[PDB]
Amino acid sequence: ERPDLAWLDEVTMTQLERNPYEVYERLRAEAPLAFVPVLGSYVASTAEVCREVATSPDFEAVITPAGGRTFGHPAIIGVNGDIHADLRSMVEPALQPAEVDRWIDDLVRPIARRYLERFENDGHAELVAQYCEPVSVRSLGDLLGLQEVDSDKLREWFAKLNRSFTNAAVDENGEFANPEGFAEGDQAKAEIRAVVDPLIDKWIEHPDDSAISHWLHDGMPPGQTRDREYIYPTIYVYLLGAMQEPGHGMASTLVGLFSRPEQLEEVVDDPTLIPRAIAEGLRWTSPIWSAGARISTKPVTIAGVDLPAGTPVMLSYGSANHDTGKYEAPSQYDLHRPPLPHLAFGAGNHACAGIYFANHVMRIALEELFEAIPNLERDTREGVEFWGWGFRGPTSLHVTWEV
Numbered sequence: 075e076r077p078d079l080a081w082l083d084e085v086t087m088t089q090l091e092r093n094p095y096e097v098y099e100r101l102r103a104e105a106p107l108a109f110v111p112v113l114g115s116y117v118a119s120t121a122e123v124c125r126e127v128a129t130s131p132d133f134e135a136v137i138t139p140a141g142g143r144t145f146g147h148p149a150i151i152g153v154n155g156d157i158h159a160d161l162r163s164m165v166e167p168a169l170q171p172a173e174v175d176r177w178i179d180d181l182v183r184p185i186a187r188r189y190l191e192r193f194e195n196d197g198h199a200e201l202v203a204q205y206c207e208p209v210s211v212r213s214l215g216d217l218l219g220l221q222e223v224d225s226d227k228l229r230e231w232f233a234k235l236n237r238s239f240t241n242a243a244v245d246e247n248g249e250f251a252n253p254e255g256f257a258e259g260d261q262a263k264a265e266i267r268a269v270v271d272p273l274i275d276k277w278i279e280h281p282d283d284s285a286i287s288h289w290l291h292d293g294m295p296p297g298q299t300r301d302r303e304y305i306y307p308t309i310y311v312y313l314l315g316a317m318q319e320p321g322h323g324m325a326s327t328l329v330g331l332f333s334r335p336e337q338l339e340e341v342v343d344d345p346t347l348i349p350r351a352i353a354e355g356l357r358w359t360s361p362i363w364s365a366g367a368r369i370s371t372k373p374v375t376i377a378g379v380d381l382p383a384g385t386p387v388m389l390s391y392g393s394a395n396h397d398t399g400k401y402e403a404p405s406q407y408d409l410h411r412p413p414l415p416h417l418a419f420g421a422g423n424h425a426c427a428g429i430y431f432a433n434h435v436m437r438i439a440l441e442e443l444f445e446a447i448p449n450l451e452r453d454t455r456e457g458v459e460f461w462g463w464g465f466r467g468p469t470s471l472h473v474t475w476e477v
């Protein structure tokens with residue numbers, strides 16, 4: 075529709091998944107709020123527009139079309155008002171900083187050690203599959219009450235949910251271009267139900283200290299539980315992003331550090347720098363890159379565009395975190411970048427509920443890795459490819475070390 079952006083008509087979904095930076099660098103300059111035809115939605119690409127939409131009283135939560143097809147209702151990311159307040163009150167207790175501090179070390183450190191012990195003497199590893207993803211999913215899985223679900227299975231589920239959630243391509247008429255791409259998400263949800271329904275059955279009668287047990291029972295009248303259909307979409311929210319993103323973040327941090335070998339050495343020598351390294355990693359490749367959306371509740375003007383009420387806007391936080399209005403050479407990883415705010419955890423009422431937990435999982439995991447393999451080196455015989463528009467991270471991370 076917008077004449078000077080007619081080039082956007084030729085942007086493909088594959089291009090956004092493999093490398094969205096070049097298109098989004100153009101958007102941040104030409105149209106910070108732009109309608110992207112293949113996504114069928116306005117997209118916010120700069121830090122100012124993302125922050126404004128995410129915090130505006132004239133926007134509220136919505137799920138993208140493919141996200142809604144994947145999760146249904148009421149997913150915590152896509153609801154408002156009394157339902158959202160209830161779901162936030164449901165998930166927040168185990169995520170409270172003072173609560174996390176009581177058990178996070180005893181949770182993650184033995185998990186990290188267990189996975190490291192399988193390969194720390196090999197001289198070679200593929201860290202995404204052998205370390206980052208397993209530690210991420212085993213940590214949260216145990217917190218949730220899914221101790222009996224293998225990390226292989228948790229990893230398969232978040233991968234299938236990822237592909238379904240981000241199956242966003244639409245054709246001329248706004249219809250999904252890849253309707254068969256939701257089937258593996260449906261297959262994952264069916265498997266999840268088969269595993270989790272018996273656990274919910276027993277937690278209803280025998281509550282325990284698992285997070286999902288508390289989701290059923292906390293704040294409810296005596297002898298009542300939240301209905302499982304009411305909580306399952308938020309379970310899916312966790313089994314996608316909460317399972318995937320800490321692993322994405324630590325892997326992207328490592329890739330960034332490998333790109334700056336002097337900085338990798340610094341961090342290995344001084345592990346108190348790991349939190350700073352992770353924060354730059356999340357800015358540099360944001361795990362939740364463009365998954366979330368908001369919808370306008372009244373006519374509103376954003377970046378010079380007059381949006382009617384009812385207009386969805388996708389929040390491309392991963393682009394916002396390369397805003398050259400804020401950062402110098404954002405495409406480069408730099409441990410010594412001056413600490414500034416970033417949007418990798420979103421903003422506003424629907425900002426990430428698990429920041430403190432997530433940052434601790436990534437920090438402990440990197441601590442234990444650099445302890446066990448101080449001479450870690452990137453396998454330069456291999457290249458690192460990143461994949462994902464909605465959720466983005468490296469697809470593998472081959473490393474080596476002298477044994």
Ligand code: HEM
Nearest residue numbers: 150151316319320323362366419420421424426427428432
């Ligand atoms: C490095 C890892 C993570 C990153 C980068 C991340 C990022 C985000 C982002 C960007 C949002 C969306 C905010 C928006 O649309 O404005 C979000 C939402 C959320 N995240 Fe995190 N997340 C991470 C890990 C986790 C973990 C481990 C948990 C749970 C233990 C978690 C729980 C949640 C919840 C419940 C929401 C929805 C909040 C709401 O809609 O009210 N996140 N996260």
Ligand SMILES: COc1ccccc1O
Nearest residue numbers: 151311312314315316365
């Ligand atoms: C925390 O997990 C999510 C965040 C945004 C979209 C999908 C998710 O699973």
